[PDB]
Design a protein around this ligand. Structure first.
Ligand code: ATP
Ligand code: ATP
Ligand code: MG
Ligand code: MG
Lengths: 50, 464, 99, 47, 50, 505, 120, 69
């Protein structure tokens, strides 16, 4: 979903800004030196909330 | 685990790896050059991924002599540097290899150069005032311990002389372990500094490491990180206060810009990196005095083309507490400590910390100088004739008081052939109060040019 | 009764500590809060903090309590958004800023 | 007689201000136009 | 709804708040202040500017 | 399937490539499995190419010399040699193009090795202090801001001022040092011309031919009619030739005619490759380029041999504006500068040297002890004279208090003027400085002072020359020589006649 | 090329007249921008010095014959630091001026001695 | 000026390379093709004539702009 929070294996959280045909762009919030190719991404089914 | 080189351009090198294993970010890689005349090994650092098991790396040495098909081996660790008690007293390169005595080392502690700043709960502000024999810095913008000092200025306006004078004063007055670094300095200056420190019998406790002009940008952007790592090691384990010196930080920024154009990222305003604030912030926040450790630093920063509008000093302006500025016009006037009194500002100056008299004197000096600057527009064409005497008195007072700020620091011993001087701040404030009273208008102006104290002032005035 | 919220963007931690000390001496720390986004953090927190502060204030505003909001810096947020947009390959505009 | 020389020197000093301001204005105009063209070409080529 | 201009020249002149009354303005007007203040104080900005 | 790919990669009679692109002196060639960064590629037309880029399937290349000989379908053959220039001790007395081909037409040349154009540089531990004087024929520069061996000095000035005159004067003055056979006092000279008209090069070469000092001079030319490649490479070849004599124990003076043209050519080349621009279309590589070019010049340590190269860059600016990109960068990287402005030149004085801006960071070791002792406080006196002259229309304040100061300023201003193509030695110049400072010429009217000293000078050359030898040997001004010199001055000026025939008293 | 043929075939000295130089650089910049290159240095072609030198290098005298030329250049916006006049003036020897006040005096040459000079 | 603006809009919409002030290179040529038609004729062809009075609008008393020059 647009602007939907996504979970990452290391415990960091991401946000999907724009949705392309076959790819999804995301921005990392916290520490981002532990991100590599081949990880697993899960959707939380919820929009950015505080 | 064997890699293959596929594409090279400039100092940036592409590489591919087998699907099974791909090293993480900031992992050193080793390559070799088989050419007979230019045989050399190269160390690479991971920058980013591109998919298809491809990696982009930045070369630590000139890339001339490379060829496709060269095997690449990894270490599975970040760049490491040696740290220990006996390090002080030798010269180092970017990689950490010694220069005066090759082969020395490889038995001390080894630490990486990628770390994190301390937590918020360990932060604490400090307000211990530090004084220096100079009168202009102590009267207007006093220095504070545990913070940062900035010396903004143009090109060829004598920053190096002031740095040398201040470090000499601190080294003579105070001890403790000291660390000197540098980026974008001339080798002649380095040799002169080495000779001077050898003469002064103080080089034993001073750590030295620096890059120079003729180096690929990687060393120019990593020597500072190595210096901060060594300084942090001396700060934490020993529990000792440390003096830190860094020269011409602006060059660092320039280096980054270059590699950005090589990586292909979209340019920003005035052809800079898409992100530059984050790098400056993570470099600056590494320096911070904890409760049990006091660190005092001093950064000299360059200004390109004498245009303050560039983001390079503008971004740095937000991470400082004590600032001094240099101007071309003041230098052209003739006085050598060409420090702008109007533009300079500090954060420690306050009636809560300092007595009321000093505050009042500073305020009055600022007011007089500002009024003279305002009148400068009118006076520049007609002159003093059109103005009234009620402003003629202020013009004369401003001229004399501005001429009084000149001084002969000892760092010019090899130029003017005269000894230095020292002035306690009590004498300074007393003399400035006397001058602001207006009694000294009888004496001629040229007496105050390059004078040490009020006694010397009177002697020179009466001798002419 | 007035409840206030302080938001800081792109400032040194020691400045935030000094502001906290001033508030503590003033004694207002009973009825105030601070949201901190130091410059050492990534672009996401700098871009996101003001919306969090606004939502925090809005929750009390709906309940009928008066709320005061103070933003420290706003150009830094624009710079962070520009950096994010340029990194995301979006086309630029005037003064390299996003449209 | 004392009055005359003041006006003479005033005019002589006033000319140089015109000269310097003209130089500064020309420099600023050139900088502005080159910045605008650089920005527009960079924006156009990116697509 | 309103802005305040602060100049360094005024700050060094001697005005500690250093607000420029010539340009600073508030769109809401005198309805916000108490009635006694508007009775005692009124049209002072015009006097300062003139 | 991985093994097949590995064997395909490892499998790789002479390699041949084909041309696919052209236009604006840029080529794209592919098909060379054995690649090499910055290798010289021989095109079938006799032209040469340099590989500044490398891709997966093809490689780009810049071209040198004539570039219209490029057509698609041509075959190119690689050469394993890295870019280099032949170097030898027979190069002196010749004129060559950047690639080393003799263009003068006198004959053929032979060399011994081929040093690379890009190598390492001396470190901090391999250097030494500056303690040798580099004498110059111009007395103004040696009296105001001295220059020593191994120290880079900058010359910045507007058009039509005569920098090449100063360079030619220095080259001519080096002949006296060349005359003796002492290796320690030996000095070689290298001149590099960039983006210059052919007539100027011919004129300077013929002037040197009149001077008869080609036995130690090497000239490299990159005329404006050529393409960008020579205009970008020539200073590097000059520096390599200089460094070859560096690393054998010889003193060298190198002169660059211009550096703005090289920067402009590099900007054009960079923009032709679609790289994003920066300030005033200048990429971020300009500072790196100039720093690499200028950092190679430094005095070596004692153990290695103690060679030295003194560099003379020349920079021109428009409408005397120091505030600019390239001038600021170059004045930042180097130490010391000399300023030449059009105001004094238009007024009438030929050597146009300002006194309030030209400051050199050189130490006092450059000047001989005699020179330091005889001359002192000249710059401050000239600055205060330039401050006082602005009030020459108001004599009601001076009133016989600074009249002697104005007289001294006038005499000193008229003394420092120098003619054309007149190099000067240390002996007569220190004598002239002493005579000017002591104020003996206060009586002589300004309209003839010049000729007077010249006559005096040659008279001292006709009479006893023991004082010259004495102050040449001990490098100091002995007192008895001072009384002898003042006595000779008195005797000459008693019998000397002025322009109008009034004897000085 | 025609003048060069005359000089090198007949041995006669020739004079060349050029009306303007600004239009030459204008056409150069236009043909540069139509080929889809990248502009630089205040909307100019990146190699203007190359073409200017290639044009001016065929004017000097050799082999005992001379090719003298005269040009009339136009300064834009009364600026003498513009790149085109700056590059043009690098190959100049003598400059001549004409005005109306000297014509109002009523003489034939109508040349102001206070505004003209030479490098020889 | 309006004609030049319309031509610039068409050229930009047709995806052609731009130049200084977002103007196509050939724009100058355009005017040379239009304003040069009018000229006096000789008596051989009848001796016709044509006179043109183009009007240009400038802003802020500025003449150094592209189209005015
Ligand atoms: N107090 C002084 N007395 C005499 N000369 C001085 C004084 N301060 C500066 N100078 C002169 O000014 C120059 C300063 O040189 P220095 O190497 O310090 O320059 P810098 O401005 O720090 O360098 P950069 O251009 O690299 O920033 C020298 O020529 C020095 O002699
Ligand atoms: N001492 C001198 N006496 C007379 N004329 C002199 C003297 N020194 C220089 N000149 C004059 O200066 C010029 C020599 O300098 P030159 O023509 O090479 O120009 P430049 O200033 O070096 O610049 P550029 O390379 O742009 O031509 C000649 O016009 C020459 O007459
Ligand atoms: Mg310096
Ligand atoms: Mg010349």
């Amino acid at each position: 979903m647009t602007q939907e929070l996504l979970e990452f294996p290391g415990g960091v959280l991401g946000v999907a800004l724009n949705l392309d045909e076959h790819s999804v762009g995301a921005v990392i919030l916290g520490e981002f030196e532990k991100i590599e190719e081949g990880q697993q991404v899960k959707r939380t089914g919820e929009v950015l909330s505080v | 685990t064997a890699g293959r080189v596929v594409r090279i351009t400039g100092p940036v090198v592409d590489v591919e790896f087998p699907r099974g294993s791909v090293p993480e970010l900031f992992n050193a890689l080793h390559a070799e050059i088989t050419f007979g005349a230019l045989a050399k090994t190269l160390t690479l650092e991971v920058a980013q991924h591109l998919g298809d098991s491809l990696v982009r790396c930045i070369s630590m040495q000139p890339t001339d002599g490379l060829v496709r098909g060269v095997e690449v081996t990894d270490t599975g660790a970040s760049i490491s540097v040696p740290v220990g008690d006996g390090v002080k007293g030798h010269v180092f390169n970017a990689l950490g290899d010694c220069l005066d005595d090759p082969g020395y080392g490889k038995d001390f502690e080894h630490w990486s150069i990628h770390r994190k700043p301390p937590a918020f709960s360990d932060l604490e502000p400090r307000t211990e005032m530090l004084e220096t024999g100079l009168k202009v810095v102590d009267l207007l913008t006093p220095y504070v311990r545990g913070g940062k000092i900035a010396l903004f200025g143009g090109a060829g306006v004598g920053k190096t002389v002031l740095i040398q004078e201040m470090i000499n004063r601190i080294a003579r007055n105070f001890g403790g372990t000291s660390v000197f670094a540098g980026v974008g300095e001339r080798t002649r200056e380095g040799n002169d500094l080495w000779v001077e420190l050898a003469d002064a019998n103080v080089l034993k406790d001073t750590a030295l490491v620096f890059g120079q002009m003729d180096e690929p940008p990687g060393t120019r952007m990593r020597v500072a990180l190595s210096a901060l790592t060594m300084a942090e090691f001396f700060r934490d384990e020993q529990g000792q206060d440390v003096l830190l010196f860094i020269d011409n930080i602006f060059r660092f920024t320039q280096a980054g810009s270059e590699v950005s154009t090589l990586l292909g990222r979209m340019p920003s305003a005035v052809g800079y990196q898409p992100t530059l604030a984050d790098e400056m912030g993570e470099l600056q926040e590494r320096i911070t005095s904890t409760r049990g450790r006091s660190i005092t630093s001093m950064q000299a920063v360059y200004v390109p083309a004498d245009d303050y509008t560039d983001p390079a000093p503008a971004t740095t302006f937000a991470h400082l507490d004590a600032t001094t500025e240099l101007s071309r016009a003041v230098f052209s006037k003739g006085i050598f400590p060409a420090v702008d009194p109007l533009a300079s500002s500090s954060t420690i100056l306050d009636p809560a910390i300092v007595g009321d008299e000093h505050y009042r004197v500073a305020q009055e000096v600022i007011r007089i100088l500002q009024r003279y600057k305002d009148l400068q527009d009118i006076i520049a064409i007609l002159g003093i004739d059109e103005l009234s005497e009620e402003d003629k008195q202020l013009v004369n007072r401003a001229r004399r008081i501005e001429r009084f700020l000149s001084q002969n620091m000892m760092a010019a011993e090899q130029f003017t052939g005269q000894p230095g001087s020292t002035v306690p701040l009590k004498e300074t404030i007393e003399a400035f109060d006397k001058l602001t009273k207006g009694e000294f208008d009888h004496l001629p102006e040229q007496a105050f040019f390059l004078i040490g104290g009020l006694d010397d002032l009177a002697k020179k005035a009466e001798s002419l | 009764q007035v409840r206030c919220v302080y938001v800081a963007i792109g400032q040194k931690g020691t400045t935030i500590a000094s502001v906290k000390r001033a508030l503590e001496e003033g004694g207002a720390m009973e009825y105030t809060t601070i949201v901190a986004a130091p410059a050492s953090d990534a672009a996401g927190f700098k871009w996101l903090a003001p919306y969090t502060g606004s939502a925090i204030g809005q929750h009390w505003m709906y309940n009928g309590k008066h709320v005061l909001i103070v933003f420290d810096d706003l150009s830094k947020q624009a710079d962070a958004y520009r950096a994010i947009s340029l990194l995301l390959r979006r086309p630029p505009g005037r003064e390299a800023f996003p449209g | 007689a004392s009055r005359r020389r003041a006006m003479k020197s005033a005019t002589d000093n006033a000319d140089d201000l015109i000269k310097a301001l003209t130089l500064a204005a020309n420099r600023e105009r050139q900088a502005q136009i080159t910045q605008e063209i650089s920005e527009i070409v960079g924006g156009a080529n990116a697509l | 709804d309103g802005q305040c201009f602060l100049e360094s020249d005024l700050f060094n002149q001697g005005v500690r708040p250093a607000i420029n009354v010539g340009v600073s303005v508030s769109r809401v007007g005198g309805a916000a202040q108490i009635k006694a203040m508007k009775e005692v104080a009124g049209s002072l900005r015009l006097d300062l500017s003139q | 399937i991985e093994g097949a790919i590995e064997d395909y990669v490892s499998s790789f009679r002479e390699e041949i490539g084909t041309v696919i692109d052209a236009g604006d002196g840029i080529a794209h060639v592919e098909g060379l499995p054995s690649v090499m960064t910055q290798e010289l590629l021989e095109f079938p037309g006799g032209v040469l190419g340099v590989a500044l880029n490398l891709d997966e399937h093809s490689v780009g290349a810049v071209i040198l010399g004539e570039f219209e000989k490029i057509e698609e379908g041509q075959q190119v053959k690689r050469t394993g040699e890295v870019l280099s220039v032949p170097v030898g001790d027979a190069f002196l007395g010749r004129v060559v193009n950047p690639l080393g081909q003799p263009i003068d037409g006198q004959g053929d040349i032979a060399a011994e090795t081929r040093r690379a154009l890009e190598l390492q540089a001396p470190s901090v531990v391999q250097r030494q202090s500056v303690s040798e004087p580099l004498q110059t024929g111009i007395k103004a520069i040696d009296a105001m801001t001295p220059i020593g061996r191994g120290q880079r000095q900058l010359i910045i000035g507007d058009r039509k001022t005569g920098k090449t005159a100063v360079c030619v004067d220095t080259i001519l003055n080096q002949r006296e040092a060349w005359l003796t056979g002492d290796p320690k006092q030996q000095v070689r000279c290298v001149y590099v011309a960039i983006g210059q008209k052919g007539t100027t090069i011919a004129s300077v070469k013929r002037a040197l031919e009149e001077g008869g000092a080609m036995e130690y001079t090497t000239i490299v030319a990159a005329p404006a009619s050529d393409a960008a490649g020579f205009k970008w490479l020539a200073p590097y070849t000059g520096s390599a030739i200089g460094q070859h004599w560096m690393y054998n124990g010889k003193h060298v003076l190198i002169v660059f005619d211009d550096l703005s043209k090289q920067a402009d050519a590099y900007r054009a080349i960079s923009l032709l490759l679609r790289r994003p621009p920066g300030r005033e279309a200048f990429p971020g590589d300009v500072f790196y380029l100039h720093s690499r070019l200028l950092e190679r010049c430094a005095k070596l340590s004692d153990e290695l041999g103690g060679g030295s190269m003194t560099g003379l860059p020349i920079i021109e600016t428009k409408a005397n504006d120091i505030s600019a990109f390239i001038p600021t960068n170059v004045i930042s990287i180097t130490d010391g500068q000399c300023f030449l402005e059009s105001d004094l030149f238009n007024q009438g004085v030929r050597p146009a040297i300002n006194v309030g801006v030209s400051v050199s960071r050189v130490g006092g070791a450059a000047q001989i002890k005699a020179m330091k002792e005889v001359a002192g406080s000249l710059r401050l006196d000239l600055s205060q004279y330039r401050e006082l002259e602005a009030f020459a229309a108001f004599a009601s304040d001076l009133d016989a208090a600074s009249k002697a100061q104005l007289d001294r300023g006038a005499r000193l201003v008229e003394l420092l003027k120098q003619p054309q193509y007149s190099p000067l030695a240390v002996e007569e110049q220190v004598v002239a400085i002493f005579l000017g400072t002591q104020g003996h010429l206060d009586s002589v009217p300004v309209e003839d002072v010049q000729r007077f000293e010249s006559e005096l000078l040659e008279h001292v050359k006709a009479s006893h020359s023991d004082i010259f030898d004495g102050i040449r040997e001990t490098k100091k001004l002995s007192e008895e020589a001072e009384e002898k010199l003042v006595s000779v001055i008195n005797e000459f000026k008693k019998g000397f006649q002025a322009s109008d025939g009034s004897s000085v008293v």
